[PDB]
Amino acid sequence: MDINGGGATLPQALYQTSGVLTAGFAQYIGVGSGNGKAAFLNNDYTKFQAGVTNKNVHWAGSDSKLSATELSTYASAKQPTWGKLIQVPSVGTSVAIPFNKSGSAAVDLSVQELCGVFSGRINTWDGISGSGRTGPIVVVYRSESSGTTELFTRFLNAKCNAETGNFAVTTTFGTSFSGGLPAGAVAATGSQGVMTALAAGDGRITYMSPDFAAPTLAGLDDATKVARVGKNVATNTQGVSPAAANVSAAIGAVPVPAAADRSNPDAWVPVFGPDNTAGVQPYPTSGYPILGFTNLIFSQCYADATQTTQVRDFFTKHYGASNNNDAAITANAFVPLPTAWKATVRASFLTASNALSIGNTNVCNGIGRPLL
Numbered sequence: 613m614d615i616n617g618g619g620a621t622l623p624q625a626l627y628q629t630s631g632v633l634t635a636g637f638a639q640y641i642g643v644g645s646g647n648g649k650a651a652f653l654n655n656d657y658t659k660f661q662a663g664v665t666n667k668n669v670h671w672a673g674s675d676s677k678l679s680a681t682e683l684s685t686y687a688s689a690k691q692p693t694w695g696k697l698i699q700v701p702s703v704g705t706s707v708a709i710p711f712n713k714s715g716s717a718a719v720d721l722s723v724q725e726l727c728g729v730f731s732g733r734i735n736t737w738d739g740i741s742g743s744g745r746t747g748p749i750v751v752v753y754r755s756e757s758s759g760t761t762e763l764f765t766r767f768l769n770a771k772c773n774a775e776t777g778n779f780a781v782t783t784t785f786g787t788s789f790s791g792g793l794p795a796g797a798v799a800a801t802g803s804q805g806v807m808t809a810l811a812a813g814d815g816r817i818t819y820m821s822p823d824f825a826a827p828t829l830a831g832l833d834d835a836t837k838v839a840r841v842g843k844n845v846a847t848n849t850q851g852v853s854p855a856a857a858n859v860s861a862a863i864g865a866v867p868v869p870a871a872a873d874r875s876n877p878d879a880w881v882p883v884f885g886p887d888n889t890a891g892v893q894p895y896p897t898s899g900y901p902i903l904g905f906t907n908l909i910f911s912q913c914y915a916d917a918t919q920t921t922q923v924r925d926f927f928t929k930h931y932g933a934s935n936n937n938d939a940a941i942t943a944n945a946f947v948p949l950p951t952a953w954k955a956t957v958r959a960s961f962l963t964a965s966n967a968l969s970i971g972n973t974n975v976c977n978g979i980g981r982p983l984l
């Protein structure tokens with residue numbers, strides 16, 4: 613039986629790049645982070661392929677963290693027979709703001725203008741300073757439980773203090789803002805489904821994976837199509853683009869998971885959040901401001917020996933010092949993890965003597981996610 617994974621659409625083109633997933637891995641299935649988490653946690657392959665029940669789920673991609681309830685339920689129901697789950701960052705990512713509104717002038721949103729567009733306070737292109745554009749704004753958002761939504765609403769939660777209401781951190785944008793969606797907002801499903809909808813009417817704007825936000829990497833720098841973020845007119849300061857190079861310094865400054873906490877999967881996924889708040893990283897003051905991590909969710913243990921080996925071999929590649937996936941990571945508009953981050957992941961999840969290591973012959977002795 614092949615190893616089956618799926619989930620988050622934000623990075624699905626990375627996991628679909630030839631050679632990124634190693635031997636024994638079936639091609640990755642992009643369904644959204646909420647579906648990916650449910651697939652793994654319940655061993656429910658129908659969350660990957662509706663109507664198909666003759667396969668097991670071995671791993672998920674997610675840009676939404678496992679919640680307290682998700683973690684505790686798995687620990688009590690599954691961990692005794694299947695082993696601990698593993699949650700680890702895969703790559704860093706910006707969150708881009710593509711839009712469909714023609715004109716040669718650059719669209720460069722201040723953070724407060726971004727807040728106002730997504731709250732519905734600013735609902736005309738006239739209301740974005742220096743835009744060269746007029747007429748109505750329609751916001752497009754993700755209908756389903758989305759990790760892109762979680763990454764984006766972390767930023768709005770941290771920055772948007774001057775609305776007639778508050779943005780909550782969530783996977784469902786339709787409930788994020790306490791004052792409701794903007795009038796006329798359009799729901800769509802998946803990263804690609806949102807990009808399709810962006811084009812189905814004039815004057816639309818959204819939040820998006822930096823891969824799907826432009827057909828080519830250079831397109832992220834085209835401010836006629838992908839907004840700059842960070843304008844401040846009063847200081848004569850321009851915003852910048854969501855190109856990976858504009859978030860890579862900040863991703864590199866994120867500390868490794870705290871040693872004494874490494875048995876807690878929540879400790880492994882860094883999140884950005886409000887200033888001067890322990891436990892979250894502040895959004896960066898330089899470069900492009902909207903960023904975070906997309907993650908992997910695996911089991912420590914698999915009943916089958918070959919599958920255990922194949923999962924280890926994937927980690928050996930994805931977190932390797934050499935012969936790794938970093939070139940493919942960059943090609944899909946993402947940020948590779950620092951060399952010290954990779955070493956920390958390997959020390960816990962690969963190195964055999966570690967209590968957390970995949971296939972550990974003592975900890976996994978007799979246990980693991982089932983073959984049949």
Ligand SMILES: O=P([O-])([O-])O
Nearest residue numbers: 621622645759760
């Ligand atoms: O699809 P997502 O990645 O979850 O947003």
